[PDB]
Amino acid sequence: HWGYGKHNGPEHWHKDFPIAKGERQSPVDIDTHTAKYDPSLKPLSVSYDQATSLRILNNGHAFNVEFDDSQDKAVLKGGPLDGTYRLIQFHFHWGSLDGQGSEHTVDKKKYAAELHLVHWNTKYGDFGKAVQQPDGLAVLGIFLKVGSAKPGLQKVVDVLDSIKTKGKSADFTNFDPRGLLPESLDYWTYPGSLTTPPLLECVTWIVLKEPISVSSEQVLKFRKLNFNGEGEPEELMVDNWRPAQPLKNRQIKASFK
Numbered sequence: 001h002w003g004y005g006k007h008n009g010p011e012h013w014h015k016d017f018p019i020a021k022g023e024r025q026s027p028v029d030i031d032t033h034t035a036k037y038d039p040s041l042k043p044l045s046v047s048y049d050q051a052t053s054l055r056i057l058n059n060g061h062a063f064n065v066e067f068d069d070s071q072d073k074a075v076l077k078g079g080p081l082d083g084t085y086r087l088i089q090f091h092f093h094w095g096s097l098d099g100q101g102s103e104h105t106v107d108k109k110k111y112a113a114e115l116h117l118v119h120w121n122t123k124y125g126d127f128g129k130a131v132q133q134p135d136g137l138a139v140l141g142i143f144l145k146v147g148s149a150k151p152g153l154q155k156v157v158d159v160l161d162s163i164k165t166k167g168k169s170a171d172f173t174n175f176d177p178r179g180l181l182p183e184s185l186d187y188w189t190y191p192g193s194l195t196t197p198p199l200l201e202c203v204t205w206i207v208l209k210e211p212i213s214v215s216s217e218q219v220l221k222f223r224k225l226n227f228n229g230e231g232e233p234e235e236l237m238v239d240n241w242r243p244a245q246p247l248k249n250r251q252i253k254a255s256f257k
């Protein structure tokens, strides 16, 4: 029964998920002056040409665009990663106001939203096995700021009316996630966790330096979604973000000078 409200939100999660107070929790604040350039970091390899999107789902916490991950069709490699990570889904976190919504922050700055492209390490065979491993997942995080529209996002925005409430899904084939990327693949990276329960410490975080711009109308449509199921009292799906957690014994590395 976890969520983002006053009575079931991030301050409560530790009671059911004690790893909430663990040693490598996400998100974190990225202090740009303390992050260290790591010249040994390889360029990111984002191979999304054969990506096969299937469906979009309102799961009551966010919406997921799901992909076929039964073959190496859309994969993330390189950077800090060893091996091949398959794209399984992407989703967003966003705010009720343009000045909040991201999970990671940059020098304590909050963006309007944050895109998470979730990948799992193919050496573990399936996603459920991968989340039980310290190097099981790689999540590519991309900040959203409000300004110009992101044309590659509009197909997502267009379909949200059909998945307004928890448990609703719709066909979402032939979507190209490459249209959601910024120009630069410069990034920060650190070892972390899922940012929602069960908060498993299985994620290599790769957070892009360059935000994408989306329009006020695009993010407004995110905010019309519902946490609730159909026929239940309406609760707008907004502020579905976890705040920054203590960095503890971790260093954030930068791919760029």
Ligand SMILES: CCCCNCc1ccc(S(N)(=O)=O)cc1
Pocket (backbone or CB within 6 Å): 116, 118, 128, 131, 139, 193, 194, 195, 196, 197, 198
């Ligand atoms: C054991 C099954 C866990 C399901 N949990 C999915 C999931 C994926 C990504 C993220 S995030 N927000 O860290 O990218 C959270 C939760």
Ligand code: NA
Pocket (backbone or CB within 6 Å): 147, 215, 216, 217
């Ligand atoms: Na505008």
Ligand SMILES: [Zn+2]
Pocket (backbone or CB within 6 Å): 091, 092, 093, 116, 195
């Ligand atoms: Zn997320």
